[PDB]
Amino acid sequence: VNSFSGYLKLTDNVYIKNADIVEEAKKVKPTVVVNAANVYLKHGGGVAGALNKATNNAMQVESDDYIATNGPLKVGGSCVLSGHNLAKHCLHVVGPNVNKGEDIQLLKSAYENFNQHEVLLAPLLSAGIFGADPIHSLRVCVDTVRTNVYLAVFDKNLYDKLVSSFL
Ligand SMILES: O=C(O)c1ccc2c(c1)CCO2
Numbered sequence: 001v002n003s004f005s006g007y008l009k010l011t012d013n014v015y016i017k018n019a020d021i022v023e024e025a026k027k028v029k030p031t032v033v034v035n036a037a038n039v040y041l042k043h044g045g046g047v048a049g050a051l052n053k054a055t056n057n058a059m060q061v062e063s064d065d066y067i068a069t070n071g072p073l074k075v076g077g078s079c080v081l082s083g084h085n086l087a088k089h090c091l092h093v094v095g096p097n098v099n100k101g102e103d104i105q106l107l108k109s110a111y112e113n114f115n116q117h118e119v120l121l122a123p124l125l126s127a128g129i130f131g132a133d134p135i136h137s138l139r140v141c142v143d144t145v146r147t148n149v150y151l152a153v154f155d156k157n158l159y160d161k162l163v164s165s166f167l
Pocket residue numbers: 020021022045046047050123127128129152153154155
């Protein structure tokens with residue numbers, strides 16, 4: 001049994017809810033929240049900008065030190081950093097950004113990072129300002145992630161479409 005509430009069950013291991021991932025993280029304090037990161041961990045807008053704002057910029061400060069030491073992530077890659085006031089840990093995962101021309105096949109590699117964590121609160125990778133089709137992102141998630149994932153879809157309209165169209 002876990003703390004996650006109000007989710008629709010899609011599969012054995014994937015659950016979905018219309019929710020602000022920031023508000024959900026603040027309520028649950030999950031072991032792992034996933035960030036929709038870029039390779040530079042520049043948390044400007046989208047899920048990343050919202051998570052970082054909720055940490056009062058401490059996520060960005062920590063991320064800048066990580067990059068100064070390690071250099072940029074790979075598209076499809078990840079790193080584990082603090083969850084600050086939102087979670088124990090933040091798994092920063094880089095999905096391909098279609099608005100930069102990145103290979104959508106890297107979306108499966110991105111989701112494979114989730115399998116290193118038993119339970120996660122996450123957004124749909126490469127959705128929103130990363131430009132991918134969220135229906136496709138949900139299909140890749142279900143077909144890739146084997147650990148227990150609780151997905152947070154910001155838009156109510158999109159949430160309803162993801163559920164209605166789910167095979
Ligand atoms: O899920 C998203 O795409 C998303 C993007 C931006 C944003 C949020 C979610 C919360 C407030 O700011």
